[model samples]
Target chain A: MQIFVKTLTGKTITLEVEPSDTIENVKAKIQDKEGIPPDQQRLIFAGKQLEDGRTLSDYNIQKESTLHLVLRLRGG
Target chain B: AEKDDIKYRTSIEEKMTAARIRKCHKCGTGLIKSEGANRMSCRCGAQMCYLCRVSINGYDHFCQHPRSPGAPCQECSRCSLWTDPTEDDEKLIEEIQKEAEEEQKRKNGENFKRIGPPLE
Candidate 1:
């Protein structure tokens, strides 16, 4: 269950996750592994939001497929 | 009104024609016209040579003419005011259209929200 994730700045990362995992759960795992904060999370799948509580199977993502993510943060 | 009158100088209204699409190589902000001149002067700062159509800041002179179309202009990316179409431009325009449609749908449902700048 490998998932390919691409960042907004064009960085690509691949990780293996369980098929039963929700998209938000996967995002939490990604933050834990990559040290990216949870609040900065922005995961866009096929140009649409994969908002919290949506399951991975709900989106019907195949193994080794790419999802675009961006860190939504603010500072002066 | 009196203060406004003191701030106003002798208004020299020059006849300016709107810039035509043919000669406009890049999207220009706007232009001003010179007194008694048939051509609309490029209000962009910096000197430009009309002969070779080259400016130190690289702006091409354009005018409303009867017989000819117009000269070609080159846009400089270095300049602050100049901007060209990008892939993001198309995407943004498409998103804007989608938002408009969504707004119309909401209006039909009478779900009104305060309109403001589109952010995030």
Candidate 2:
């Protein structure tokens, strides 16, 4: 199914992913496209943060699901 | 050379409107989108313009579709450099976002409606 990830920098990344794919897996794809490391990225869906090991299916994510890709603040 | 055609693989309103890089049609190398986004050449020496996705080994006219001043561009059909590829999809994304926000507000109002039984 298709999904949309809205980033902090005002860019919406369109992704094709399976429901079985984990959040970590999706992060890797985003990294490949935008050069951001997986550790520095955070994903939120359905008003909650997504765990890396959890699959999209666990969250009931379906086709055209929109997600929030937030940048993890490491330091001041 | 990456294998995925992230730029051209997905359905897009217009070519060169999605991801910056693309799988080189010649060598299948996933070329990176550098600052000089034009004239992306693969190791195989196959050259292509980023926007037009047309051969640009020696041609000067690129994605801009440039024409002589006051000359009618009879064969002009090109994308503007300034137009964001995100424009087409923004509306749908916004619809999802607004719905999410409204739902959140409802939950907040419901939760705080009364944490404890209030005696008028």
Interface RMSD of each: 21.9, 15.6
Q: After superposition, how far is residue B55 of candidate 1 from its true place, in Å?
A: 22
Candidate 2's displacement at residue A34, Å, is 1.5
Specify the highest-DockQ model's number: 2
lDDT of 2 by residue, B7-103 (tens): 2222221122223323456655434332433455655677765556665554344335656665545566543333333333344433444444455
Off by over 4 Å in 1: A71-76, B1-120
- CAPRI-style quality class for the chain A–B interface of candidate 2: incorrect
Per-residue lDDT tens digits of candidate 1, residues A1-76? 8877754344678878876788768888878767776666666443334677877666545455455564322100
For residues A1-76, what per-residue lDDT tens digits would candidate 2 score against the true structure?
8888766554788998998998889999888878889887766554345777888877656556666654322100
lDDT of 1 by residue, B1-120 (tens): 533221221010000011111111233322211122222224233343222224433322432222223433343323222222223433553455345446545645555221111224
Give candidate 2's error at residue B19 in angstroms.
Answer: 30
Query: Candidates' DockQ values?
Result: 0.01, 0.06
- Distance from true location, Cα of A10 in model 1, Å: 1.9
